[PDB]
Symmetry: C2
Subunit: 180 residues, 2 copies
Protein backbone atom coordinates (compact mmCIF):
# COMPACT_ATOMS: atom_id res chain seq x y z
CA UNK A 1 0.00 0.00 0.00
CA UNK A 2 3.02 2.32 -0.31
CA UNK A 3 5.87 2.36 -2.87
CA UNK A 4 8.83 0.04 -2.07
CA UNK A 5 11.25 3.03 -2.04
CA UNK A 6 9.35 4.71 0.82
CA UNK A 7 10.81 2.93 3.89
CA UNK A 8 10.07 3.33 7.64
CA UNK A 9 12.60 5.01 9.90
CA UNK A 10 15.42 7.49 9.22
CA UNK A 11 18.23 7.51 6.61
CA UNK A 12 21.16 5.30 7.80
CA UNK A 13 24.62 6.63 8.78
CA UNK A 14 26.97 5.71 5.90
CA UNK A 15 30.15 7.43 7.17
CA UNK A 16 30.56 10.25 4.65
CA UNK A 17 33.64 11.88 6.34
CA UNK A 18 35.83 8.90 5.58
CA UNK A 19 34.54 8.53 2.00
CA UNK A 20 34.88 12.26 1.26
CA UNK A 21 38.51 12.29 2.26
CA UNK A 22 39.32 9.15 0.23
CA UNK A 23 37.66 10.67 -2.88
CA UNK A 24 38.76 14.30 -3.05
CA UNK A 25 42.32 13.58 -4.34
CA UNK A 26 40.90 11.17 -7.00
CA UNK A 27 38.36 13.31 -8.91
CA UNK A 28 40.14 12.98 -12.28
CA UNK A 29 40.16 9.19 -11.94
CA UNK A 30 36.33 9.27 -11.55
CA UNK A 31 35.85 11.14 -14.84
CA UNK A 32 35.11 9.56 -18.20
CA UNK A 33 32.32 7.14 -19.12
CA UNK A 34 30.21 5.07 -16.72
CA UNK A 35 27.31 2.67 -17.67
CA UNK A 36 24.34 2.08 -15.28
CA UNK A 37 24.41 -1.67 -14.58
CA UNK A 38 21.45 -1.70 -12.15
CA UNK A 39 19.33 0.54 -9.88
CA UNK A 40 16.53 0.41 -7.26
CA UNK A 41 13.02 1.65 -8.27
CA UNK A 42 13.46 5.33 -9.23
CA UNK A 43 10.50 7.50 -10.36
CA UNK A 44 12.79 10.37 -11.37
CA UNK A 45 15.22 8.79 -13.91
CA UNK A 46 13.99 9.64 -17.43
CA UNK A 47 16.37 7.33 -19.33
CA UNK A 48 15.17 3.70 -19.28
CA UNK A 49 17.71 1.76 -21.37
CA UNK A 50 21.39 2.01 -22.50
CA UNK A 51 22.13 4.53 -19.76
CA UNK A 52 25.58 6.10 -20.47
CA UNK A 53 26.99 8.88 -18.28
CA UNK A 54 29.99 10.87 -19.51
CA UNK A 55 31.80 12.98 -16.87
CA UNK A 56 34.32 15.85 -17.44
CA UNK A 57 36.14 17.37 -14.39
CA UNK A 58 37.14 21.05 -14.48
CA UNK A 59 38.89 21.19 -11.11
CA UNK A 60 35.87 22.16 -9.03
CA UNK A 61 32.96 20.12 -10.45
CA UNK A 62 31.89 17.55 -13.00
CA UNK A 63 29.93 18.35 -16.14
CA UNK A 64 27.74 15.34 -17.12
CA UNK A 65 26.14 14.23 -20.34
CA UNK A 66 23.65 11.38 -19.72
CA UNK A 67 22.21 9.53 -22.73
CA UNK A 68 20.16 6.44 -23.66
CA UNK A 69 16.62 5.47 -24.67
CA UNK A 70 13.69 7.16 -22.86
CA UNK A 71 10.50 5.40 -21.67
CA UNK A 72 8.74 6.40 -24.95
CA UNK A 73 11.40 4.71 -27.09
CA UNK A 74 13.17 7.88 -28.27
CA UNK A 75 16.83 8.76 -27.87
CA UNK A 76 17.36 11.27 -25.00
CA UNK A 77 20.19 13.45 -23.68
CA UNK A 78 20.18 15.06 -20.22
CA UNK A 79 22.66 17.70 -18.99
CA UNK A 80 23.87 17.34 -15.43
CA UNK A 81 26.36 18.62 -12.88
CA UNK A 82 28.06 17.11 -9.79
CA UNK A 83 29.40 19.64 -7.25
CA UNK A 84 30.19 19.85 -3.49
CA UNK A 85 27.11 20.37 -1.28
CA UNK A 86 26.60 24.15 -0.87
CA UNK A 87 26.44 24.01 3.02
CA UNK A 88 29.86 22.31 3.20
CA UNK A 89 28.47 18.81 3.93
CA UNK A 90 30.88 15.97 3.01
CA UNK A 91 28.96 14.72 -0.01
CA UNK A 92 28.16 15.85 -3.56
CA UNK A 93 24.99 17.34 -5.07
CA UNK A 94 23.81 15.74 -8.34
CA UNK A 95 21.81 18.34 -10.33
CA UNK A 96 20.01 18.00 -13.71
CA UNK A 97 18.47 20.59 -16.04
CA UNK A 98 14.73 20.91 -15.56
CA UNK A 99 14.89 18.86 -12.33
CA UNK A 100 15.84 18.95 -8.64
CA UNK A 101 19.23 18.33 -7.00
CA UNK A 102 19.90 15.57 -4.46
CA UNK A 103 22.74 14.38 -2.28
CA UNK A 104 24.93 11.69 -3.84
CA UNK A 105 27.35 9.50 -1.88
CA UNK A 106 30.02 7.25 -3.52
CA UNK A 107 29.62 4.30 -1.15
CA UNK A 108 32.53 2.38 -2.79
CA UNK A 109 34.55 2.50 -6.01
CA UNK A 110 37.81 1.16 -7.52
CA UNK A 111 37.71 3.85 -10.31
CA UNK A 112 38.60 1.35 -13.13
CA UNK A 113 35.77 -1.23 -12.85
CA UNK A 114 32.80 -0.26 -10.64
CA UNK A 115 31.10 2.36 -8.47
CA UNK A 116 28.29 1.92 -5.86
CA UNK A 117 26.16 5.11 -5.52
CA UNK A 118 23.61 6.17 -2.84
CA UNK A 119 21.04 8.96 -2.27
CA UNK A 120 18.62 9.29 0.70
CA UNK A 121 16.10 11.81 1.98
CA UNK A 122 14.25 11.98 5.31
CA UNK A 123 10.53 12.87 5.30
CA UNK A 124 8.54 14.60 8.06
CA UNK A 125 6.35 11.52 8.77
CA UNK A 126 8.81 8.89 10.07
CA UNK A 127 9.97 7.40 6.68
CA UNK A 128 12.84 7.92 4.21
CA UNK A 129 13.30 7.34 0.49
CA UNK A 130 16.55 5.99 -0.91
CA UNK A 131 17.90 5.42 -4.41
CA UNK A 132 20.89 3.11 -5.10
CA UNK A 133 22.91 2.46 -8.27
CA UNK A 134 25.64 0.14 -9.54
CA UNK A 135 27.89 1.68 -12.27
CA UNK A 136 30.42 -0.12 -14.51
CA UNK A 137 33.23 1.05 -16.84
CA UNK A 138 31.79 -1.40 -19.42
CA UNK A 139 28.35 -2.54 -20.67
CA UNK A 140 28.84 -5.69 -18.58
CA UNK A 141 29.99 -6.08 -14.94
CA UNK A 142 31.50 -9.30 -13.54
CA UNK A 143 29.97 -10.97 -10.46
CA UNK A 144 33.12 -10.36 -8.38
CA UNK A 145 32.37 -6.62 -8.61
CA UNK A 146 28.56 -6.80 -8.29
CA UNK A 147 29.14 -8.68 -5.00
CA UNK A 148 31.34 -5.86 -3.67
CA UNK A 149 28.41 -3.44 -4.15
CA UNK A 150 25.95 -5.95 -2.68
CA UNK A 151 28.01 -6.16 0.52
CA UNK A 152 28.28 -2.36 0.75
CA UNK A 153 24.51 -1.88 0.43
CA UNK A 154 23.70 -4.70 2.90
CA UNK A 155 26.12 -2.97 5.29
CA UNK A 156 23.78 0.06 5.40
CA UNK A 157 20.60 -2.03 5.66
CA UNK A 158 19.41 -1.59 2.05
CA UNK A 159 17.48 -4.63 0.77
CA UNK A 160 19.51 -5.61 -2.30
CA UNK A 161 16.56 -7.57 -3.70
CA UNK A 162 15.34 -4.09 -4.74
CA UNK A 163 17.94 -3.85 -7.57
CA UNK A 164 16.82 -4.25 -11.18
CA UNK A 165 19.21 -4.72 -14.15
CA UNK A 166 19.42 -2.04 -16.88
CA UNK A 167 19.48 -2.91 -20.61
CA UNK A 168 23.07 -2.50 -21.95
CA UNK A 169 25.24 -4.08 -24.66
CA UNK A 170 25.33 -4.69 -28.35
CA UNK A 171 21.73 -3.63 -28.97
CA UNK A 172 22.49 -0.07 -27.70
CA UNK A 173 23.33 2.74 -30.16
CA UNK A 174 26.18 4.11 -28.04
CA UNK A 175 28.04 5.71 -30.99
CA UNK A 176 24.87 7.68 -31.85
CA UNK A 177 24.31 8.57 -28.14
CA UNK A 178 27.80 10.00 -27.76
CA UNK A 179 26.98 12.56 -30.58
CA UNK A 180 23.88 13.72 -28.64
Amino acid sequence: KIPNFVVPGKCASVDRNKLWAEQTPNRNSYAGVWYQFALTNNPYQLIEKCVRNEYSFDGKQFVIKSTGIAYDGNLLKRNGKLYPNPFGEPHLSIDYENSFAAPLVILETDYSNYACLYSCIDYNFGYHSDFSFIFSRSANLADQYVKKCEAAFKNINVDTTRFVKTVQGSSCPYDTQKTV
Copy 2:
Protein backbone atom coordinates in the same frame (compact mmCIF):
# COMPACT_ATOMS: atom_id res chain seq x y z
CA LYS B 1 -2.02 8.50 -8.00
CA ILE B 2 -2.56 7.98 -4.33
CA PRO B 3 -1.21 10.95 -2.28
CA ASN B 4 -3.02 14.19 -3.08
CA PHE B 5 0.30 15.81 -4.13
CA VAL B 6 0.86 13.17 -6.85
CA VAL B 7 -1.12 14.61 -9.81
CA PRO B 8 -1.56 13.44 -13.46
CA GLY B 9 0.35 15.01 -16.35
CA LYS B 10 3.44 17.19 -16.86
CA CYS B 11 4.41 20.17 -14.67
CA ALA B 12 2.68 23.39 -15.79
CA SER B 13 4.34 25.98 -18.02
CA VAL B 14 4.35 29.09 -15.77
CA ASP B 15 5.94 31.91 -17.82
CA ARG B 16 9.13 32.08 -15.78
CA ASN B 17 10.89 34.58 -18.08
CA LYS B 18 8.40 37.42 -17.42
CA LEU B 19 8.56 36.67 -13.66
CA TRP B 20 12.40 36.66 -13.69
CA ALA B 21 12.50 40.05 -15.49
CA GLU B 22 10.14 41.56 -12.90
CA GLN B 23 11.87 40.08 -9.90
CA THR B 24 15.54 40.21 -10.54
CA PRO B 25 16.01 43.97 -9.84
CA ASN B 26 13.85 43.71 -6.67
CA ARG B 27 15.75 40.97 -4.73
CA ASN B 28 16.57 43.48 -2.04
CA SER B 29 12.83 44.12 -1.42
CA TYR B 30 12.18 40.35 -0.96
CA ALA B 31 14.57 40.14 2.05
CA GLY B 32 13.39 40.28 5.67
CA VAL B 33 10.83 38.12 7.54
CA TRP B 34 8.08 36.05 5.83
CA TYR B 35 5.47 33.94 7.77
CA GLN B 36 4.03 30.80 6.10
CA PHE B 37 0.28 31.49 6.03
CA ALA B 38 -0.73 28.31 4.19
CA LEU B 39 0.69 25.41 2.13
CA THR B 40 -0.33 22.34 0.11
CA ASN B 41 0.61 18.89 1.59
CA ASN B 42 4.41 18.79 1.88
CA PRO B 43 6.37 15.71 3.15
CA TYR B 44 9.66 17.67 3.37
CA GLN B 45 8.70 20.64 5.62
CA LEU B 46 9.95 19.71 9.12
CA ILE B 47 8.38 22.79 10.80
CA GLU B 48 4.65 22.32 11.49
CA LYS B 49 3.57 25.52 13.32
CA CYS B 50 4.64 29.17 13.72
CA VAL B 51 6.80 28.99 10.58
CA ARG B 52 8.97 32.14 10.39
CA ASN B 53 11.48 32.50 7.47
CA GLU B 54 14.18 35.23 7.75
CA TYR B 55 15.90 36.11 4.47
CA SER B 56 19.15 38.07 3.96
CA PHE B 57 20.30 39.13 0.44
CA ASP B 58 24.02 39.34 -0.42
CA GLY B 59 23.79 40.31 -4.08
CA LYS B 60 24.26 36.73 -5.30
CA GLN B 61 22.02 34.57 -3.08
CA PHE B 62 19.70 34.67 -0.10
CA VAL B 63 20.58 33.04 3.22
CA ILE B 64 17.55 31.75 5.13
CA LYS B 65 16.92 31.05 8.84
CA SER B 66 13.65 29.12 9.26
CA THR B 67 12.19 28.64 12.75
CA GLY B 68 9.05 27.35 14.50
CA ILE B 69 7.50 24.30 16.19
CA ALA B 70 8.38 20.79 14.89
CA TYR B 71 5.89 17.91 14.57
CA ASP B 72 7.01 16.62 17.99
CA GLY B 73 6.14 19.97 19.60
CA ASN B 74 9.73 21.18 20.15
CA LEU B 75 11.36 24.31 18.78
CA LEU B 76 13.40 23.86 15.57
CA LYS B 77 15.79 25.93 13.39
CA ARG B 78 16.57 24.97 9.77
CA ASN B 79 19.28 26.59 7.54
CA GLY B 80 18.45 27.36 3.90
CA LYS B 81 19.65 29.13 0.73
CA LEU B 82 17.94 30.54 -2.35
CA TYR B 83 20.22 31.03 -5.42
CA PRO B 84 19.90 31.20 -9.27
CA ASN B 85 19.45 27.79 -10.95
CA PRO B 86 23.00 26.52 -11.75
CA PHE B 87 22.21 25.73 -15.44
CA GLY B 88 21.10 29.32 -16.07
CA GLU B 89 17.37 28.55 -16.08
CA PRO B 90 15.07 31.53 -15.27
CA HIS B 91 14.19 30.39 -11.72
CA LEU B 92 15.74 29.93 -8.29
CA SER B 93 16.88 26.79 -6.40
CA ILE B 94 15.67 26.48 -2.77
CA ASP B 95 18.27 24.38 -0.84
CA TYR B 96 18.13 23.24 2.80
CA GLU B 97 20.79 21.63 5.04
CA ASN B 98 20.45 17.82 5.16
CA SER B 99 17.78 17.89 2.42
CA PHE B 100 17.55 18.33 -1.33
CA ALA B 101 17.30 21.37 -3.62
CA ALA B 102 14.21 22.16 -5.71
CA PRO B 103 13.12 24.77 -8.22
CA LEU B 104 11.26 27.73 -6.60
CA VAL B 105 9.13 30.15 -8.72
CA ILE B 106 7.57 33.34 -7.24
CA LEU B 107 4.22 33.35 -9.11
CA GLU B 108 3.16 36.74 -7.63
CA THR B 109 4.39 39.07 -4.90
CA ASP B 110 3.93 42.75 -3.83
CA TYR B 111 6.99 42.59 -1.47
CA SER B 112 5.10 44.43 1.31
CA ASN B 113 2.20 42.06 2.14
CA TYR B 114 2.25 38.68 0.34
CA ALA B 115 4.09 36.18 -1.87
CA CYS B 116 2.76 33.12 -3.76
CA LEU B 117 5.44 30.36 -4.13
CA TYR B 118 5.50 27.30 -6.43
CA SER B 119 7.77 24.21 -6.89
CA CYS B 120 7.19 21.23 -9.26
CA ILE B 121 8.86 17.93 -10.14
CA ASP B 122 8.16 15.49 -12.98
CA TYR B 123 8.01 11.67 -12.68
CA ASN B 124 8.99 9.17 -15.41
CA PHE B 125 5.45 7.64 -15.35
CA GLY B 126 3.79 10.85 -16.62
CA TYR B 127 2.61 12.37 -13.33
CA HIS B 128 4.09 15.31 -11.38
CA SER B 129 4.23 16.53 -7.78
CA ASP B 130 3.92 20.20 -6.89
CA PHE B 131 4.30 22.13 -3.62
CA SER B 132 2.69 25.57 -3.15
CA PHE B 133 2.89 28.18 -0.40
CA ILE B 134 1.23 31.48 0.64
CA PHE B 135 3.64 33.81 2.48
CA SER B 136 2.73 36.94 4.50
CA ARG B 137 4.74 39.78 6.07
CA SER B 138 2.46 39.37 9.16
CA ALA B 139 0.94 36.52 11.19
CA ASN B 140 -2.43 37.16 9.52
CA LEU B 141 -3.09 37.95 5.85
CA ALA B 142 -5.99 40.04 4.63
CA ASP B 143 -8.56 38.30 2.41
CA GLN B 144 -7.79 40.45 -0.62
CA TYR B 145 -4.23 39.07 -0.70
CA VAL B 146 -5.33 35.44 -0.06
CA LYS B 147 -7.62 35.88 -3.09
CA LYS B 148 -4.76 37.13 -5.24
CA CYS B 149 -2.70 33.99 -4.59
CA GLU B 150 -5.82 31.80 -5.17
CA ALA B 151 -6.19 33.36 -8.67
CA ALA B 152 -2.48 33.04 -9.48
CA PHE B 153 -2.51 29.32 -8.63
CA LYS B 154 -5.81 28.67 -10.49
CA ASN B 155 -4.24 30.33 -13.54
CA ILE B 156 -1.61 27.53 -13.67
CA ASN B 157 -4.19 24.76 -12.92
CA VAL B 158 -3.11 24.12 -9.37
CA ASP B 159 -6.14 22.93 -7.30
CA THR B 160 -6.38 25.59 -4.59
CA THR B 161 -8.64 23.45 -2.40
CA ARG B 162 -5.33 21.70 -1.55
CA PHE B 163 -4.18 24.62 0.72
CA VAL B 164 -4.23 24.13 4.51
CA LYS B 165 -3.67 27.04 6.96
CA THR B 166 -0.58 27.09 9.17
CA VAL B 167 -0.87 27.92 12.90
CA GLN B 168 0.32 31.50 13.53
CA GLY B 169 -0.30 34.31 16.04
CA SER B 170 -0.46 34.72 19.82
CA SER B 171 0.19 31.07 20.65
CA CYS B 172 3.60 31.31 18.85
CA PRO B 173 6.82 31.93 20.78
CA TYR B 174 8.29 34.15 18.06
CA ASP B 175 10.63 36.06 20.38
CA THR B 176 12.19 32.79 21.52
CA GLN B 177 12.46 31.59 17.90
CA LYS B 178 14.57 34.59 16.92
CA THR B 179 17.06 33.77 19.67
CA VAL B 180 17.52 30.83 17.27
